[PDB]
Design a binder for this molecule. Structure first.
Ligand SMILES: Nc1nccc(-c2c(-c3ccc(F)cc3)ncn2C2CCN(Cc3ccon3)CC2)n1
Length: 292
């Protein structure tokens, strides 16, 4: 009975709910399933209107969801996107918090491509985490999508491509678990940083958890300090021990990139492609969740 934008029937909450609650929806016209993000019109720091423009700039790219509608419904700012499947965090949990090397490699390939595509559209994501990557539905079931441009920001001019300046004393924009070491140091995020976080995501998939996860502290501030310290005292070689050398090569390459350097995305994809080949995995999309 409730119809957002006089078109999308509101269904079950999938939520929830910091910066916005997410609801299931159905288009009255097409019959297509949608996802509806709701944001309170009274919040201290608005984001939904800014995020919608970013999404529009990204339109037409592979693994970029299409924004169907923007509106205002009661005391809420409303955004409508095509419905996507479970996130990599949902699937990770569903697979008992361990992925096989084949799955990690299949995911790594598309994830590097999504980050590269955002970078081609003059933005850095700044919140690269498994929760922000979603599988498509039906025939797009094997496609990895990137979402959430809430912390995204321009790294270069749209017209000239002049990179933003180097700056320190920056606040932690994003999740502490996947933040780059340079982000912990208060350094201005750039392209390298999105890929460094990606490397921690892949290692998290490999290990089941990172060495800086589950650290017990007395305050939020004390916990970030513990993560920051743990992450800096953990060398790439210790973190990646017992895993193929490619994960260390990927991480060291990311940390060795200069602030304004254009990353060699092709090389990074090829590292994992070559490993995939050497491992003798079959060239299909039979992920771990398809074997349970
Ligand atoms: N399904 C779907 N399909 C499309 C988008 C979304 C969605 C949106 C969203 C953004 C703009 C918009 F216009 C409509 C919706 N924001 C977050 N999500 C999902 C992120 C992943 N969690 C699950 C989880 C929790 C921890 O780790 N994974 C489920 C909501 N959701």
């Amino acid at each position: 009975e409730l119809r957002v934008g006089n078109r999308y029937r509101l269904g079950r909450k999938i939520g929830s709910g910091s910066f916005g609650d997410i609801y299931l929806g159905t288009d009255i016209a097409a019959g297509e399933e949608v996802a509806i993000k709701l944001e309170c019109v009274k919040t201290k720091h608005p984001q939904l209107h800014i995020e919608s423009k970013i999404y529009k700039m990204m339109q037409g790219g592979v693994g970029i969801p299409t924004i169907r509608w923007c509106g205002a419904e009661g005391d809420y700012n409303v955004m409508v996107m095509e419905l996507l499947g479970p996130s990599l965090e949902d699937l990770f949990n569903f697979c008992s918090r361990k992925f096989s090397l084949k799955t990690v490699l299949l995911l790594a390939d598309q994830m590097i491509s999504r980050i590269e595509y955002i970078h081609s559209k003059n933005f850095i994501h700044r919140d690269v985490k498994p929760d922000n990557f979603l599988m498509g539905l039906g025939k797009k079931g094997n496609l990895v999508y990137i979402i959430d441009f809430g912390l995204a920001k321009k790294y270069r001019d749209a017209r000239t491509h002049q990179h933003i300046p180097y700056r320190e004393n920056k606040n932690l924009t994003g999740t502490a678990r996947y933040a780059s070491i340079n982000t912990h140091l208060g350094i201005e995020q750039s392209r390298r940083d999105d890929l460094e976080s990606l490397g921690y995501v892949l290692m998290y998939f490999n290990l089941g958890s990172l060495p800086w996860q589950g650290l017990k502290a007395a305050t939020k501030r004390q916990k970030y300090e513990r993560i920051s310290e743990k992450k800096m005292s953990t060398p790439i070689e210790v973190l990646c021990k017992g895993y193929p050398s490619e994960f260390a090569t990927y991480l060291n390459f990311c940390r060795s990139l200069r602030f304004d350097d254009k990353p060699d995305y092709s090389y990074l994809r090829q590292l994992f492609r070559n490993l995939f080949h050497r491992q003798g995995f079959s060239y299909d999309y039979v992920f771990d969740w398809n074997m349970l």
